Symmetry: C5
Subunit: 92 residues, 5 copies
């Protein structure tokens, strides 16, 4: 139960660290149109980032951004990759 | 669907419900490999998906919207156009 | 004569909508090194975005970002693609 | 071109001249397909182009800088490294 | 020098801007490791250390406005290089 946001917050905080997480999956040959499968990778990336924020003893993560790639092998999409990153903060 | 969305933050009091994401895509016909205006549809669809998620979380709108885009190639031709939209769902006060 | 910016503005406004535009061109075989040809696509993307801002009855666009792709056909760059997007606002 | 540039905004009074963009690129030799440190010079070139455009618009500097990057492949090898830089040219007060 | 702050967003505090800085880091995948996108973790760390060292050479206190670009570079129809670019604005407080 730890907060996450794309932008900053108007409140007093100190900065613990910037954290990053990558998650990925492999597509079946028949599923090369299934870009909806990115949904689970964003949620996995967030949970990895939140766990890292909790290990740093922060209250949450500001400044979240995502990078995405669709990686091709032998002229077909084969991997979907999300990178998430943000700044872990502690309020006051 | 009457719910606000913005690329940046807002100077107002809010609480943060959650960050939400949506992906939309389409498959190009062989003759339409030059039709990058077809991304318009996908940005619209991504926003609708995001707004629906904001409404299920019982927020007033979405701040901090960004889009990632890909043109995915199959056997040396563009075949899919993909938009990912994401942002922070907030509740005012 | 309508303003556009990458960041927000410290002033009172209401939000009309987020708008997006895509611009693209096809490279000749001999022009696969000509990445300066993105310049005109950025300008076209802005003009499309401004047009949309004016249709929504806003004063300008905050939060502008651009995505870019170089799309390959048969192992050569063939299309240059810009996506522009931002938030249309009305001052006060 | 002793002229300021930043990724974020500034807490100060300004007016907005325009948004500006610059692209810079280079071609890799076959033996240099692992040399991604060669992006270094392209970022610098992109900044120089953006600053020169800011100076033509008679601004004091550039806020909101972002970069897009691509590694463009020809016949299944990286051949071009491409940087796009863009930002908002401002004038203080 | 070692312990220097870095953040994705700005800070609500008084500062002057030294310069914008950039770093790139990369690695080459083995054929058997074309699924190993976890290996980006290293590259983000390396990119940050390069950026911090540039901030320290400019005599700043830290880096605001950090962003990362990423690419997965293919050679002969397989992923061969993972590339991170990091960039941000080096500042000095007061």
């Amino acid at each position: 139960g730890m907060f996450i946001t794309t932008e900053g917050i108007n409140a007093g905080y100190t900065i613990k660290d910037v954290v990053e997480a990558t998650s990925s999956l492999m597509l079946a040959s028949e599923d090369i149109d299934k870009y909806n499968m990115f949904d689970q990778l964003f949620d996995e990336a967030k949970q990895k980032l939140k766990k890292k924020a909790d290990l740093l003893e922060g209250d949450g993560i500001i400044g979240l951004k995502y990078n995405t790639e669709v990686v091709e092998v032998n002229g077909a999409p084969k991997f979907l990759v999300v990178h998430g990153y943000g700044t872990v903060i502690l309020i006051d």
